[PDB]
Amino acid sequence: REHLFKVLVIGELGVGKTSIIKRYVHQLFSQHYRATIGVDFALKVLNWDSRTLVRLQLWDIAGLERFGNMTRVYYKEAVGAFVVFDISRSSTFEAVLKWKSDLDSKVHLPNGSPIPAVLLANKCDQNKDSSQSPSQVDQFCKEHGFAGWFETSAKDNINIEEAARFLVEKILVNHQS
Amino acid sequence: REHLFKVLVIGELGVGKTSIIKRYVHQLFSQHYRATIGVDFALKVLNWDSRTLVRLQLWDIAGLERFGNMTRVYYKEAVGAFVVFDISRSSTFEAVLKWKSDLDSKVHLPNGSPIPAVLLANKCDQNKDSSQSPSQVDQFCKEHGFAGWFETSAKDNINIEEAARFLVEKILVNHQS
Amino acid sequence: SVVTPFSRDDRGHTPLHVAAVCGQASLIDLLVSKGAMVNATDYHGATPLHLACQKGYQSVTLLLLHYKASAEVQDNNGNTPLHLACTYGHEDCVKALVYYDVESCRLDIGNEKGDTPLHIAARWGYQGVIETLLQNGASTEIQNRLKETPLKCALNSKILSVMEAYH
Amino acid sequence: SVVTPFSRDDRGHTPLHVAAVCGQASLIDLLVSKGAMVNATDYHGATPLHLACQKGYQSVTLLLLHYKASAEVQDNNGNTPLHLACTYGHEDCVKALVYYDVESCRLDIGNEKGDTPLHIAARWGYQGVIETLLQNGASTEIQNRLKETPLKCALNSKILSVMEAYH
Ligand SMILES: Nc1nc2c(ncn2[C@@H]2O[C@H](COP(=O)(O)OP(=O)(O)CP(=O)(O)O)[C@@H](O)[C@H]2O)c(=O)[nH]1
Ligand SMILES: Nc1nc2c(ncn2[C@@H]2O[C@H](COP(=O)(O)OP(=O)(O)CP(=O)(O)O)[C@@H](O)[C@H]2O)c(=O)[nH]1
Ligand SMILES: [Mg+2]
Ligand SMILES: [Mg+2]
């Protein structure tokens, strides 16, 4: 058996969304910023069991797009999401709730329940703009319907593989019950 | 002395707006319909006196565009308008008030007063879909701020030259007082 | 008096065609809500989607797919909106087409000339497109009418190489 | 947390650049209302207006002119948005540029290479453009750096003829 999952990657500008995806899929990173024009896509293939394999459709959504009108279209029939913020810019953390509202505003799993979301504190190879504790972030997640969270770095390949896996699990658990 | 005037041509689809302009400017007509994409333009040059000459910027606005959001932009600093309807389609006459509202909604002459509008009953070479009298149309114009009106035909060059002149006069009268 | 979304000019352009080729997405929403036929076809077989993909308007392209536009309609030259997006290298639109559909996107559909989208992307050398196509399973073997594979249609050695990479 | 319209990537693209090149007019309204710099220039001298005219989005082109965008900004190659619209034959955009301005539109501005828009339109043979330009007073005499007039740049005899028509 094989699966195809639509997974969103969302969050403010310059946060690393594209870079994460690019690392996770092609093991590359660039310091150079090129802002995403509307929506970008990438495909990830996974040998999960030997029973089973998963195609991951990654929908890289530009941070600007939450001020436009297109997100309803982009989000449709998504089965999971990363929401991402820059650990060295607290502005971007305040903003994750706006994305999360937007998301849950506009997509449910077929049974009416909000899709699995995983939070990503990106650029952890850098210095904390905010001293918020892991403990607080743990609380936050439970309070706002996030299945999980990870300090990540696109630059230094940290926790991306792990967060991907964590999410896919949650997804598979929904698509066998 | 020479003038440049922005003049709008507005009204429902297939009414003849483009065809009028095309005749008035290049003395051509085609039976073939090509719907206007957004906005079209044409330039008319007039020897008015020997004292004076008038450049006429004709802003052909596609009939569809009143359901979009762009008319505020198109109308800006216009100094006169044709509003046009198909004499053989009464639907299009009901619609002239919507255009006229739109217009006056969104442009005044500098002194706060609505710009000179001239109504055009086009395709008069055809058979009346409605028996409304000239007399009723005369009333209509006075009741809804139209300076004038003309039975016109792009096909058979009727009254276009005359209506153009009538409008330009009204305009000149505003731009010398 | 309200809109008529079924209106045609003499090249078979609906409002929805015009709306698409301008880019006016809000106008699309409106027309569709008023009953506009999304897969309406002009005098040469072009859907609003064909026009968006030609012109390169990803936003519109997606909104049309969102309103159920078919991506497999062939124009008078046998071109899908994907074929058009490939001939004009709108990679952003290509991707929308490939990934929207969820898998049910065929990359094997031949043109008039037998050309798949990959043939076209190779001819005009559009690396980003080419990679996208291959990554989602475009074939390198399919031959067109001239019996040339997409390999043989490549513009350079650069490109040829990128293609053999998967082969 | 609300938008930041002054954000840049490393090619100097503002949101307003991105908004323009997508076609998202509503997003333009919004960005402009939030203080976005309309004549902001990217790493190679391109304004949002340059991007709209390249891409052929008349709606956006006009909306930018409506918000006071300058049509005379020259990019790294000395091209105005008009020069770009002419090289890609977007006649609808050309016209917007020529007629928006009310007369204060110069058609004599040379490129890097000395080329006016008319030179460009002649080279790539875009009759509709060409006529539009001439009708609003483009010169046939101005020579570029190679000292070739727009006449000499014509693609055909067809075109040459149309140009001499005013000459
Ligand atoms: N040090 C460091 N820099 C990173 C990391 N991830 C991204 N960056 C840098 O941040 C900048 C933005 O990354 P990018 O992926 O383009 O951000 P984005 O979320 O896609 C911004 P947009 O959504 O508007 O297109 C880039 O220059 C990138 O190099 C990271 O993990 N560590
Ligand atoms: N008999 C006759 N037909 C006319 C006349 N004017 C226009 N038509 C026909 O009506 C059709 C529409 O004319 P056109 O100028 O394209 O209409 P329009 O107002 O510009 C329609 P749109 O605004 O959507 O682009 C054309 O086929 C044209 O030949 C007229 O005076 N008499
Ligand atoms: Mg990005
Ligand atoms: Mg018209």
Residue numbers in the entry:
A (entry chain A), B (entry chain A): 22 to 198
C (entry chain D), D (entry chain D): 452 to 618
How does the study describe this entry?
VARP is a Rab32/38 effector that also binds to the endosomal/lysosomal R-SNARE VAMP7.
We were able to crystallize a 1:1 complex of the smaller VARP fragment (residues 451–640) with the GTP hydrolysis-defective mutant of Rab32 (Q85L) in the presence of the nonhydrolyzable analog of GTP, GppCp. The three complexes in the asymmetric unit all have the same structure, with root-mean-square deviation (rmsd) values of 0.32 Å (for 306 Cα atoms of molecules A and B) and 0.33 Å (for 313 Cα atoms of molecules A and C). VARP ANKRD1 contains five tandem ankyrin repeats that form a slightly curved stack. The P loop (residues 32–39) stabilizes the Mg2+-coordinated triphosphate moiety of the nucleotide, while Switch-I (residues 48–61) folds over the nucleotide molecule and stabilizes the γ-phosphate of the GppCp. The elongated interface consists of a central hydrophobic patch of residues from helices α2B (L513 and L514) and α3B (Y550 and Y551) of VARP and residues from Switch-I (V60), interswitch (F62, L69, and W80), and Switch-II (M91, V94, K97, and Y95) of Rab32. Flanking the hydrophobic core of the interface are two salt bridges formed through Switch-II of Rab32 (D480VARP-R93Rab32, H517VARP-K97Rab32) and a third one through the interswitch of the GTPase (K546VARP-D61Rab32).
